[PDB]
Amino acid sequence: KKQKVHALFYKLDIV
Amino acid sequence: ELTQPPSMSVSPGQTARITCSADVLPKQYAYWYQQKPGQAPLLLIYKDTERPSGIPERFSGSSSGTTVTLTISGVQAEDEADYYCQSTDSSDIYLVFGGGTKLTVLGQPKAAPSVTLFPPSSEELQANKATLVCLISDFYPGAVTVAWKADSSPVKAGVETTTPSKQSNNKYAASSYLSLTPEQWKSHRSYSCQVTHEGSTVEKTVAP
Amino acid sequence: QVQLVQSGAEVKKPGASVKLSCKASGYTFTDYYIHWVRQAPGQGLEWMGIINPRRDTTTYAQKFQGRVTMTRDTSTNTVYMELSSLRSDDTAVYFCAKNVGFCNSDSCYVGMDVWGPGTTVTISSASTKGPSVFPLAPSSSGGTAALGCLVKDYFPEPVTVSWNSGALTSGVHTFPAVLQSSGLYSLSSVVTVPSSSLGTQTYICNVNHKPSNTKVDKRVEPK
Numbered sequence: 001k002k003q004k005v006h007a008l009f010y011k012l013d014i015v
Numbered sequence: 016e017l018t019q020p021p022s023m024s025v026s027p028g029q030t031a032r033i034t035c036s037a038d039v040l041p042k043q044y045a046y047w048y049q050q051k052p053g054q055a056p057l058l059l060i061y062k063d064t065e066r067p068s069g070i071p072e073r074f075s076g077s078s079s080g081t082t083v084t085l086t087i088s089g090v091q092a093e094d095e096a097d098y099y100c101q102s103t104d105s106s107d108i109y110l111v112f113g114g115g116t117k118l119t120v121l122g123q124p125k126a127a128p129s130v131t132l133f134p135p136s137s138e139e140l141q142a143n144k145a146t147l148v149c150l151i152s153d154f155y156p157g158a159v160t161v162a163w164k165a166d167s168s169p170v171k172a173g174v175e176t177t178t179p180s181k182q183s184n185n186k187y188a189a190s191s192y193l194s195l196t197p198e199q200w201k202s203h204r205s206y207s208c209q210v211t212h213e214g215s216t217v218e219k220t221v222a223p
Numbered sequence: 224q225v226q227l228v229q230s231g232a233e234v235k236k237p238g239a240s241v242k243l244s245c246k247a248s249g250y251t252f253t254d255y256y257i258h259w260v261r262q263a264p265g266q267g268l269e270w271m272g273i274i275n276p277r278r279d280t281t282t283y284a285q286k287f288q289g290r291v292t293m294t295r296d297t298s299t300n301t302v303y304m305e306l307s308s309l310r311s312d313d314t315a316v317y318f319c320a321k322n323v324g325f326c327n328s329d330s331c332y333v334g335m336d337v338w339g340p341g342t343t344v345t346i347s348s349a350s351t352k353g354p355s356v357f358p359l360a361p362s363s364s365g366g367t368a369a370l371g372c373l374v375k376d377y378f379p380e381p382v383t384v385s386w387n388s389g390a391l392t393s394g395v396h397t398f399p400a401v402l403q404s405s406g407l408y409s410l411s412s413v414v415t416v417p418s419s420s421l422g423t424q425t426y427i428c429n430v431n432h433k434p435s436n437t438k439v440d441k442r443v444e445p446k
Contacts (some may be wrong), residue, residue, distance in 0.1 A: 044332060046323070046334035046335070048268075050268075054340075055318060055338035055339060055340050055341060056268065056318070056320075056338050057338070058323065058334070058335060058336050058337075058338075061323050061332065061334050062332055066308075067336065086268075095380070097267075099267065099268055101268075101334060101335075103333065108282065109270070109282075109284050109285065110258075110270040110273075110284075110333065111270065112260075112267060112268040112269065112270060114267050115267045115268070115269075131369050131413065133359040133371065133373070133411075136357045136358050136359065136360065136373070136420070137446070138357050138358065139357045139373075139375075140376075142355075145373065146357075146409075148359060148371075148373055148375065150371075150398060150409055150411055150413060152396060152398075175401045175403050175404070175409075176401065177398070177399055177400075177401045180399045182396075188396070188398055188399070189398075190398045190401060190411060191401075191412075192401060192403075192409060203235075209319070
């Protein structure tokens with residue numbers, strides 16, 4: 001249940 | 016927000032358990048860092064329980080519900096430091112640190128302060144200034160109060176005192192400065208710096 | 224080995240801006256995010272934000288949105304953090320740190336595995352001033368005697384003090400400086416020496432205040 005893909009990933013690798 | 020105790024004491028060889036708590040922890044990994052004064056933090060634990068290469072097994076980490084815990088076994092004097100947990104907000108975006116936990120390793124022997132008091136130098140008096148210098152070292156624990164007197168009467172004006180700071184031998188030091196005109200300095204028979212530590216006082220006197 | 228090199232201490236007046244640098248080496252710069260974290264004197268760590276050098280994208284903590292700018296230069300593997308409209312509350316040590324994990328669609332763990340040493344930033348209205356140096360002459364403490372140098376009214380930190388140009392190392396105690404209400408600093412350096420050498424060995428304190436580019440050698444003799 002621990003989130004393994006941090007939301008910052010989507011914020012930062014989207015363009 | 017992440018809550019951990021501001022402070023904790025333990026004896027050498029004992030085991031320290033630093034806990035950090037927040038509603039968000041069931042869904043977010045936490046990280047533990049050690050920081051020694053004047054140094055960069057050092058990562059101890061990541062993803063709640065994994066220990067990097069170079070970190071000794073004395074340090075371990077665990078998770079349980081809304082808490083995460085750093086455990087230090089066989090505490091040694093060199094584990095005295097601040098320990099910080101770190102996770103992410105309820106926003107799931109912004110990183111937050113706990114307030115940090117200062118770990119004190121008990122056993123340091125108490126020690127009364129040594130006091131050195133210097134009067135104004137000749138050179139300073141020729142420059143029409145006067146500064147008395149009271150230097151306080153080698154005391155433990157690190158709290159002292161400094162009081163200044165001129166001719167039996169307390170002096171509060173012109174006093175500047177540092178906070179206690181830890182020396183290389185793990186005892187503390189501090190200093191206090193009394194600024195005077197050369198006329199005040201020459202006007203009194205003596206001046207005294209009185210340092211109070213653990214209910215007892217050490218006093219030095221100088222005279223023009 | 225991963226290393227992060229940060230730019231030297233900064234002293235700024237209220238209202239100014241400061242641009243700090245973090246030069247990364249020992250790993251693939253564009254594979255990892257870089258964090259900035261600050262720590263005000265005596266306080267705890269506070270996260271400021273993160274930059275992804277691959278895509279040049281950023282995110283800052285809510286309290287720093289609008290006055291922080293992070294940028295990067297891949298030619299030199301350098302990250303920059305610019306903080307604007309500085310206030311007394313911005314006095315702190317500013318760290319950069321490499322993200323612990325490589326982030327992709329299958330996994331992204333966000334923490335700091337390697338930290339830079341920190342850049343000290345001090346916000347003050349004071350202006351640069353070299354110290355006035357005075358001898359603390361010994362007087363009357365068994366077989367040892369204390370002599371020193373008083374380093375008065377300088378700005379900013381730091382000053383260094385050596386004795387006899389670095390020859391004399393044993394028995395030297397340079398006290399932390401006091402910050403006076405004038406905004407200027409003073410400190411004292413004292414050296415403990417055998418009481419017999421007074422009159423036989425010479426004692427000179429060498430005060431070095433790089434921010435004002437001043438050095439002072441002061442002989443300390445008995446009175």
